[PDB]
Design an enzyme around this catalytic site. Structure first.
Site, PDB file in Angstrom:
ATOM      1  CG  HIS A 129      18.169 -38.462   2.496  1.00  0.00           C
ATOM      2  ND1 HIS A 129      19.213 -38.610   1.612  1.00  0.00           N
ATOM      3  CD2 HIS A 129      18.614 -37.753   3.569  1.00  0.00           C
ATOM      4  CE1 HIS A 129      20.248 -37.949   2.139  1.00  0.00           C
ATOM      5  NE2 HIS A 129      19.948 -37.420   3.311  1.00  0.00           N
ATOM      6  CG  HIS A 164      24.828 -37.848   2.512  1.00  0.00           C
ATOM      7  ND1 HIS A 164      24.385 -36.819   1.680  1.00  0.00           N
ATOM      8  CD2 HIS A 164      23.956 -37.967   3.532  1.00  0.00           C
ATOM      9  CE1 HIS A 164      23.292 -36.335   2.250  1.00  0.00           C
ATOM     10  NE2 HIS A 164      23.002 -36.988   3.368  1.00  0.00           N
ATOM     11  CG  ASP A 206      20.552 -38.673   6.582  1.00  0.00           C
ATOM     12  OD1 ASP A 206      21.435 -38.581   5.710  1.00  0.00           O
ATOM     13  OD2 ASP A 206      19.676 -37.804   6.787  1.00  0.00           O
ATOM     14  CG  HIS A 221      22.164 -36.152  11.669  1.00  0.00           C
ATOM     15  ND1 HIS A 221      22.444 -37.253  10.858  1.00  0.00           N
ATOM     16  CD2 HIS A 221      21.720 -35.139  10.889  1.00  0.00           C
ATOM     17  CE1 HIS A 221      22.169 -36.853   9.614  1.00  0.00           C
ATOM     18  NE2 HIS A 221      21.726 -35.596   9.589  1.00  0.00           N
TER      19      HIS A 221
END
Ligand SMILES: O=C(NO)C1(COc2ccc(C#Cc3ccc(CN4CCOCC4)cc3)cc2)CCOCC1
Ligand SMILES: [Cl-]
Ligand SMILES: [Zn+2]
Ligand SMILES: [Zn+2]
EC number: 3.5.1.108
Length: 267
Positions: free
Chosen positions: A225, A73, A229, A252
């Site tokens: 969001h 973030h 990311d 991720h």
């Protein structure tokens, strides 16, 4: 654009989403050519893919026995503002989650930018590439502007949704919060994560329910969001990025796999 740092030291503090511990950050100005790096217990940890140590449920960095969880973030905010030289001193084990979004970092950093004397050398995606893992896919291709699309396929009422960020629209993703599905919370707790998660910093969704009394900030808050990311994970290339990206269900692990393939191809 010009390389940038911060005008003065900026501090942030609060609980971390995974550790549940209270931590503090101090963002320090740095000269041209420094890059983005973290500092903890006397050790500098560059914000680069070589220092990734974990990618399940957050992106974590480490070097020489010092680790920092959940860097995505703060890195996304620095990437969006094109801050290129800074040291993020961390007193603790994780970046504070704050309200679950990048808003507080964004608002404070944006009013404290110091332009520097060299232009940015962007990481420019040179040719198309696709990375894949168990039905998830990310494609990157050349673009003069940073453009990022995320498409989700949610197993609840949200169904399929897509969102595209383009330059100039940073304000569209910096308020989108981290989120979790109620049926996944037992797993995240069992693996020693999510200790700081609450309805004050996470949008929690069920098969049909929205737990948060305040509701969603946007009908597509989760995919906004996920774009946020991915922009943070892309900054692990070590320079602000110019390219067009499309992620289908990426997380991720796949974001970092893409970064490492792009870095190998061009260096
Ligand atoms: O933002 C990201 N990475 O950057 C991602 C973080 O993962 C996570 C983010 C948040 C969590 C959590 C949590 C959590 C939240 C609330 C309660 C409280 N309960 C709610 C149900 O009622 C009783 C009270 C309990 C637990 C777990 C994981 C990973 C990638 O996918 C998007 C999210
Ligand atoms: Cl896990
Ligand atoms: Zn897991
Ligand atoms: Zn996130």
């Amino acid at each position: 654009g010009l390389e940038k740092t911060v005008k003065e030291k900026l501090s942030f503090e609060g609980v971390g989403i995974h550790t549940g511990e209270y931590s503090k950050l101090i963002i320090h100005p740095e000269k041209e050519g420094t890059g983005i790096r973290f500092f903890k217990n006397g050790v500098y940890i560059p914000a680069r893919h070589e220092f990734v140590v974990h990618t399940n449920h957050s992106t974590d960095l480490g070097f020489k026995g010092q680790r920092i969880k959940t860097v995505e973030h703060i890195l996304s905010v620095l990437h969006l503002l094109e801050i290129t030289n800074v040291t993020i001193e961390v007193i603790g084990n994780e970046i504070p989650i704050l309200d679950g979004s990048g808003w507080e970092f964004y608002e404070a950093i944006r009013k404290n930018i110091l332009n520097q004397n060299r232009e940015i050398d962007y990481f420019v995606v040179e040719e198309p590439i696709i990375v894949e893992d168990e039905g998830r896919l990310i494609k990157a291709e050349p673009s003069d502007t940073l453009e990022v699309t995320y498409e989700g396929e949610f197993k609840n009422f949200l169904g399929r949704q897509k969102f595209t960020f383009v330059e100039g629209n940073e304000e569209e993703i910096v308020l989108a919060r981290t989120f979790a599905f109620d049926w996944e919370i037992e797993h995240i707790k069992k693996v020693g994560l999510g200790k700081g998660g609450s309805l004050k910093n996470t949008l929690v969704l069920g098969k049909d329910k929205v737990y948060n009394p305040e509701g969603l900030r946007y009908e597509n808050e989760p995919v906004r969001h996920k774009v946020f990311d991915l922009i943070g994970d892309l900054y692990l290339l070590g320079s602000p990025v110019k390219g067009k990206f499309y992620s289908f269900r990426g997380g991720h692990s796949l974001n970092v796999k893409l970064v490492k393939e792009l870095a190998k191809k061009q260096k």
